[PDB]
């Protein structure tokens, strides 16, 4: 007859050994995945534009 589900995988010695080999390889490479912290002239006429636009921004704010 036919089955509608791959049944659950039994855990075996070789399955455990493959997982242990993958873990050994990743530790030897020191390659993990982990949650890391999020931290934290120009020109004459460019300075002139920056000055006028910061003054105008301050007034609008």
């Amino acid at each position: 007859f036919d089955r509608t589900a791959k049944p659950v995988p039994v855990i075996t010695s070789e399955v455990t050994e493959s997982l242990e080999d993958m873990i050994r390889r990743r530790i030897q490479d020191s390659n993990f995945d982990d949650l890391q912290r999020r931290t934290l002239a120009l020109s004459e006429e460019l300075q002139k534009a920056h000055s006028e636009i910061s003054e105008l921004y301050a007034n609008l704010v």
Partner: protein, 59 residues
């Protein structure tokens, strides 16, 4: 479901398997029962009715 097999040993031979209804809805046979001898529990994709008939195709 109640009338396909005779024993829980039989249903355990056939469990996890794929049944449908006359009405078209699919489902699987999931586990044998204990107090009656050939009864089992099956999960379907919609609410089966009482008037219907489940079937298992076999070769």
């Amino acid at each position: 479901i109640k009338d396909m097999f005779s024993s829980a040993m039989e249903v355990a031979r056939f469990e996890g398997a794929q049944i449908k209804t006359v009405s078209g809805i699919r489902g699987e046979i999931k586990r044998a029962l204990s107090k009656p001898e050939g009864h089992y529990r099956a999960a379907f994709e919609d609410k089966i009715l009482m008037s219907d008939i489940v079937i298992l195709r076999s070769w």
